Copies of this chain bind each other. A is one copy, B any other.
């Protein structure tokens, strides 16, 4: 059956997470969906280890620390997360009400939709090697679902983080041959992955080429080889049936484009009092939105979530009059927070 919820939030970046808090203070429950395999969006994917200095009231917190703190704060409302899943279509079916379907065919029905999509859908980054589009699907792969597909062929893996290293090690001894290429001979993922890999190099079972891929060989989108340029300005050929780039993730607008929102420069325009869109029952908070003076700051997304929540309750509970209470002095609110 379809999963029914008061609110569906697209994204579990900082601004999507905090929205759980503000919606929870008003007894509005939420499911969140993110194509990333972790909560925290950009903070968690792009700068987890790095210090942030402009979260009001925290002199310094890390990307990861912030993520972990927001998860604490929202833990008392019982949000339901669906990670590694992509929101694809939205269809208006109530006044308001929305049917929202994920890439794995999961279906939600919610009263209110909150777009917290941020910079966009995180997706595998395309490596910067001319003519790349063509081999995509056939012989350039950004994921391994069935590893049996790669037995006894020549594999080019490009990259040098955990995913690259995991796939090199797992796809040997399946492979006929393989050539790992990274820009530099320096690996994060240490110590265990990095050393098993260097064991494969030293044993002749893996060939390492330090550099970057400058062109590809193959007709009808089927690979046969690749040119690498090494760090001595020398080129060299590689034999490969398959190239698997692991250059990390990147953010593209994605499905937000296909939901009949009146975008402006790939941003959703929004009322400055309620952070609602053009479509009643659809809100947008965080870096996905726009309004005069908008700033892509975490702290703004917070404000935006708080004001959105005020509007979204009136759709979820229309007969109920909202009485403004403070978290510090209201025991009703403290009861919702699980403070005795």
Hey, which bits of chain A sit against chain B, CB under 8 A?
A: 14, 18, 21-22, 25, 47, 50-59, 61, 63, 66, 69-70, 72-73, 271-274, 291-293, 295-300, 302-303, 306-307, 310-311, 324, 327-329, 333-334, 337, 339
Contacts and interface: CB of A to CB of B under 8 A. Distances in A.
A324 B297 CA distance: 10
A297 B309 CA distance: 13
A298 B302 CA distance: 11
Contacts of A329: 47, 50
A73 B59 contact: yes
Nearest to A272: B272
Contact of A328 (B22, B51, B272, B296): B51
Given A50-B329, A57-B61, A292 B306 contact: no
Nearest to A74: B59
Q: Which of A47, A54, A66, A296 has the most CB atoms of chain B within a 10 A radius of its CB?
A: A54
B59 A56 contact: no
Nearest to A300: B303
B70 A328 contact: no
Contacts of A311: 293
The 5 A-B residue pairs with the shortest CB-CB distance, nearest first, are A273-B293, A303-B303, A53-B327, A273-B292, A56-B302
Contacts of A55: 56-57
B306 A291 contact: no
B293 A53 contact: no
Nearest to A66: B57
A303 B303 CA distance: 6
A69 B57 CA distance: 5
A328 B299 CA distance: 14
